[PDB]
Subunit: 505 residues, 4 copies
């Protein structure tokens, strides 16, 4: 038996009888490729491509990265209605409510549940924060500057799963049989095999070096708010909270830079400087099939993850700077744990998570574990917990996402009142900020990162929005600066990425 | 400040005043390189090059890999005397006892102790098992078939340390000032900078793909012993042990294949099939400076590791197959822990380690920890402990190595009597088998793997030797088969490596 | 300084200025007394006396036991109104709502918060299950056979705290200054000192032996329900639950024996046979000041405990028999943990506890810890968790008790619907069964046990009521038998206690 | 079946056929007795009686205490020869080496190995430190002031085991059949039953109160050494150690008080003030059968414990005062753990224990566990480890004791050189100091405490000897004071015990 043995026609036939999506796979040895080099080869920065990587706690890359090698097709929204970009067949849900359209698409395109990597195919993309407008009634005071759709999800059928442990890549070409009929079976197989052959040959190409140097210039950028305007918004919210309007609210503002630097170069600097449990680079296509814009992020927190029937969330709140150093690091931990206020803030969000999940999980299954423990990241440590529940009968991964959306850590507690306050105090619509980036795979799983520490790159401009939680005793300047600094991590990376050069050049 | 900023001449001068070795370094971003691809670029399978990688427990690659980019020069042994291959200056110790020669070389070439990767430069290579002949009196019954020198250590001055976490490579060109005088300082700097520039440009080159497929054919190979001859040697040793000659002894035999496959290709298959905490590929040069032979291994166990004054060992003994699966896996662990015999065998080796270290560590510092706990590897689990001691005043990393040499896990308990028995029952001299591969870095640290699960590749022939511990109740056939199977892991990898082809070719 | 130094008049004066209750204490060495022997000496089975002991997990007695040495006075209820038995002064709250009467009594008689044992004085007694009728509207179908008051709490001012670790007894005579005025200070001191002197001299007396033997005869007793009647009640409740009326409900029935055996003798057999974290013996006085009845119990579970501002509960649900033995014991634990149904039942009660406490604790302080872990008791093991919260501003220990009352483990989930169902299916009012026995100390703390595994002993009759949780898949006979057996533990103890004799007599 | 059911004649007969010692037992309920009260009743301070109690870490009394109710007979030493006090039959080993005499006695009187408490019968008493003179050659410079025998062990055949958990006492009358013949079986039974009946009736008696008060006067006492003499001995030993004569040595001196206070009263004050894992009170008889002297102690450390074939030791070294308080307590622990010197001292003693046990345990069974962890006692914390080994084939509990004797913690490392130094610097023979008190039970187990924090009380005088470990950097005054203070704990207790009075008397 050969390593790169492709799925047999015989086996594909059997699978095609059972489900409307059949992955056809081929594993190769790729010990001289990294996720990035493989992306370069397989995707080449093309519209509808992506790379997803993961460094738990910003320390140690996990086993898998996933590359999208060209999705001709994406489900999105235009003038409040669900529409596909690129061509799909007659049976693909279109028009109307986009969430319902997405719900039916996922009901139709489920697969078996084998051996496959965690993500081998599915709907991959984002939900804007402003998708929440369709789940909760909110005022419409802030202006929609960026004009992004509520969602856009690639139908990602050609996927390369890079296994860092084995040094292998598993190539997947999924046959999508929308109409569910017996017809075209053998055609579907050969088509899938041909897409495998394309990815394979792309992997067969040589590559020039990107071995490089860069410096870290301070970026020049535009802010929506001065220290004064921001500090006063914070004081307003501190007043609301003291009165009992909410326990906590997460205001933000937008910053911007003009730049023509490739998105991947920004990804490269983020990966080196702020590795995180959710790294992503996504080229979002337009109706014409060129790149409308690019999303580059390194996010520290998932909204939700769904796996084998269970939805899980990881509320994160409470911060100290990592120690400079080792004795100081432990003082700081004992201090965060002893900070009763922050303990309380964290617990509020843990309860909010319990409730969110309560909406779609079977009663008596929603539990908290590893409650309020410490996690170290590259530059800071936090309190963290796990909330996990069994998806209720007939509930879906998408129900888990909508039930949790948006993260309490990006809105507040209680959530609606906090969103309301956010809308009162913020100049523009958030767009992707506080939304999610992630996937819904055909087997029923899902993983979404909160869209923070992220740049959206459009027509010569890069937007980076950042914020931070406000509580009873928050100080306006302190919050302004903490927020700006979060943003500068990304802005700094863009400025760095612009200096990328071959060493001694 | 630029990422690839090279060490300044000004700083080098100061360092040169203080020590006879001064590393000159340059860090680059190399997010599209793997250790293997970097090796290909920097070393290109040349004589005197190496790659060292590490996967703890065969699961999760550690942060660092180290590439040797061409050592013009190596300390070894010819006709019982210490000699350099390639050219060294007048002050480099030569002739006589090779251990003393190595001892003085290390005393001379120490560095400061900064920021550097774990290995940034030093003496890198092997000690044959038969080096033990110079530390203990042994009979000379077995024939020296392979004729390897007791040691050979590259003077590895051009090193690339690959950081998987940051995606960076730190290039080091060490200036070796043997004579210790003030002269040539500025020349030394420019020379080091030029070696950096060579490695840099080598990294700047493109590379063809090695994306590949392979199959796993059963190899045809030669064995020194039949099941009958081997089973009877085991029964002999079981008799000695029952009488109280020793508690345990580790006999082995040699297997061989003819093959012309590149060594790196064998490394590639080992890396995929049997990842381990010590992977190595080493091209050992001759006096002419071509490759005399190649060592390729994936070893599960260190002899000793020395770091910031402390020597540490990790005795490993007791085995079960990993579970097939998860419930079975736990039964097996409860079983190994409950196996009083194997507990005893493990404890014997732990005590042997305590004593070995007692020879060179300050009294009242040699401790055992994490005693006799379980570790899972890809295919098996073992009992494992830690023995660690403070190196006694005026003792060196090399004293730690010789004090421990050879591993009890490859000889037995008590060690000399076991070696004696090994010599009575084995046909040929072990050569590298049961020796070590590793390094002694200029800062005083050291890390050596036991040389097992290793192929030595010379003039169209690949040698793989394997064995296993014999105790009171060992069965001859069982031990024959367990030993042969250990060997076949490597032999299988050579046969696989021969099928390596571009997919669909 | 003498060990038995009594509090000084000078110090009492200062304390009397600050609070309406001033404990006057004297510590003695009592290394030849047990809690029982001390009780015999100090209380002698008199009306208004009690003994409280604690064996955590039924294994290892805790440090403290507490003896009440004659409370002349108790707050209780007659014809729905709050009344004192024995004489109290004009300022002591009487008439009306008994809970309000108890609330004001505790507000009045608070102390400082020193050095004192956990309980040094306070209101000590019970709340009937049927006290719940004043916090929730319930139907009145079942007949009130036993006619107990909703509550009765001794004003326990003479207390002996027995310290098993030191072998000492700390005697406390609390001066209760209801009117709050400066008058009678020096009189109060001498009175307290005289009560100390009485307890002291009582401790000074000799004692006859109770060294003893006993056998374990099967008791003859009366049951309210046959296996058929009980099994059918269980099936009824299983039907309600399947329909979604509740998740769980805890029906019980009453058993009875005629006996004239002293209550302490029953306590003695319980202590030997079913030691528990809450042992109690209480002699409840009547208006005439003789014993109306006696309560003897060994309870496995607290309702709530309040200490230094925090209320804590320990939901317990999920059972296996302890192992017979040690390998079997671990199988059983792995099994209980793996029992998803019982996990769910336990989680329901944990959530119910979170909510109960939510009613009186500051938001963002009610947390779960040590979630759903195993505890071993003498004969069974359970799942157990901790729910703890900060009492909200201006909330009291009594608010914690009422907020939790009655235990979900004795009612069900959700609680009211379960109580409703209990009332539909049960013949008589529960009385003390499912109520609590415990104390509210003057410093603000509280500890109450659920009143189960308890005998109420009145006019030649002993009542023991027992029950068990019903869920979706409960079997009628199994529940009948499990319930009866719980009861027989107490009934067996009464029958044993009747055989108590000096050995060979 | 009755609780106090005595062993049947039928069962005794069967047992008598199998072993020369047959315990005849009767369990009673004794919930109004403490170990002390039971001792008073059963032993009444008579010669040849004892009480043994245990408080692990000086916190929480363990389950069992053991009372010896009159041993008519003891194996001891007079003019270097083994002799019995009181009458024994012809077959009882006498004359000669006392250790051999004790060895054969134990070989003869073994029992089965059931249900019994940990100690139900055996040889109970002490070994003097100076017993070591028969296992190692030592100089004879110091004068033998106290003139104690090398050993004296009661043949303790009437034992009461007090179970604090159950509140029960298990009475044991062991039938000792020295001659091993069939004769007198039925006589032996009735005799044992009569001894049970005596203990039973003694338990049946009443008792007066000992409820009491006491003060803590500073005792006036005699010391062998001034601060100057002691500080200079310490400096001498510091010099020897610096030169490498030993790593550590434990000098001591003797203190004395005249007092006529009962020994039990001293025990009572020790029990309250310095509870420990080994409490003992022993009345040592003379040849006339009156009390020769009394031993009262509270020891923190076992020499060795032997149980079901395994010998175990618990080396203790490294000290801090407990924290005053809770934050300070943790600083102190982090500090002791970080004290590399004390770590080393502790490790030396751990190794010494490994070796001691190596002399009598099967190779490959002697292990260390729970290495060098912290234990809190009432006033101090220490580092502590466990060393445990399997007794070698044909080795006995007594071999374990002699192999370990005396504790390294009371001698030093290496042990002989330390003893030698002790003998050079100490005025008198140690006697019991640094010896052991404990038992060897008939089933093969053993438990011995190091004889420290102990008073020996003879003819109106109480001796208390104390010392402490000397190392490289010890200070003379500091050690003098630490030693004196250890002694004063006992001396203070004697002075306290003299004030014992009924409260207000
Ligand atoms: C590291 C632990 C083991 O591996 C070996 C022990 C001894 C010899 C060998 C060998 O490969 O020759 C080996 O793999 C083992 O099988 O116990």
């Amino acid at each position: 038996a050969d390593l790169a043995a492709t799925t047999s026609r015989e086996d594909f036939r059997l699978l095609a009888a059972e489900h409307r999506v059949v992955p056809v796979t081929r594993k190769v040895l790729a010990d001289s490729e990294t996720p990035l080099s493989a992306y370069r080869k397989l995707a080449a920065n093309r519209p509808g491509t992506f790379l997803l990587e993961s460094a738990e706690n910003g320390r140690s890359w996990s086993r898998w990265s996933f590359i999208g090698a060209g999705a001709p097709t994406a489900l999105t929204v235009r003038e409040g209605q669900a529409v596909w970009l690129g061509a799909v067949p007659k049976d693909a849900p279109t028009g109307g409510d986009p969430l319902r359209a997405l719900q039916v698409t996922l009901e139709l395109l489920a697969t078996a549940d084998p051996g496959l990597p965690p993500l081998s195919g599915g709907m991959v993309g984002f939900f804007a924060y402003d998708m929440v407008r369709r789940l909760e009634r909110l005022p419409e005071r802030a202006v929609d500057d960026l004009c992004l759709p509520d969602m856009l999800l690639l139908l990602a059928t050609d996927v390369a799963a890079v296994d860092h442990h084995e040094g292998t890549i598993t190539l997947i070409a999924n046959a999508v049989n929308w109409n569910g009929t017996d017809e075209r079976v053998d055609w579907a197989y050969d088509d899938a095999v041909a897409r495998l052959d394309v990815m394979t040959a792309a992997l067969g190409q040589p590559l020039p070096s990107t071995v490089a140097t860069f410096s870290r210039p301070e970026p020049r950028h535009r802010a929506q708010r001065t220290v004064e305007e921001y500090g006063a918004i914070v004081e307003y919210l501190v007043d609301q909270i003291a009165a009992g309007e909410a326990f906590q609210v997460v205001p933000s503002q937008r910053f911007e830079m003009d730049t023509d630097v490739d998105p991947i170069d920004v990804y490269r600097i983020l990966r080196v400087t702020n590795p995180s449990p959710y790294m992503y680079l996504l080229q979002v296509p337009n109706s014409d099939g060129a790149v409308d814009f690019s999303i580059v992020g390194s996010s520290p927190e998932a909204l939700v993850t769904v796996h084998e029937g269970w939805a899980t969330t990881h509320p994160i709140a409470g911060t100290r700077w990592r120690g400079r150093t080792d004795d100081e690091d432990v003082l700081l931990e004992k201090e965060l744990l002893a900070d009763d206020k922050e303990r309380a803030e964290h617990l509020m969000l843990v309860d909010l998570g319990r409730n969110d999940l309560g909406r779609v999980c079977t009663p008596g299954t929603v539990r908290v574990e590893d409650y309020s423990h410490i996690e170290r990241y590259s530059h800071v440590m936090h309190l963290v917990s796990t909330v996990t529940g069994k998806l209720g009968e007939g509930r879906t991964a998408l129900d888990a996402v909508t039930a949790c959306f948006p993260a309490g850590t990006l809105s507040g507690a209680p959530k609606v009142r906090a969103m309301e306050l956010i809308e009162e105090v913020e100049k523009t619509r958030r767009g992707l900020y506080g939304g999610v980036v992630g996937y819904l795979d055909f087997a029923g799983n899902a993983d979404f990162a909160i869209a923070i520490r992220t740049a959206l790159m459009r027509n010569g401009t890069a937007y980076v929005q950042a914020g931070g939680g406000v509580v009873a005793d928050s100080n306006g300047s302190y919050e302004y600066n903490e927020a700006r600094n979060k943003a500068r991590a990304v802005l700094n990376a863009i400025a760095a990425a612009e200096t990328l050069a071959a060493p001694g050049a």
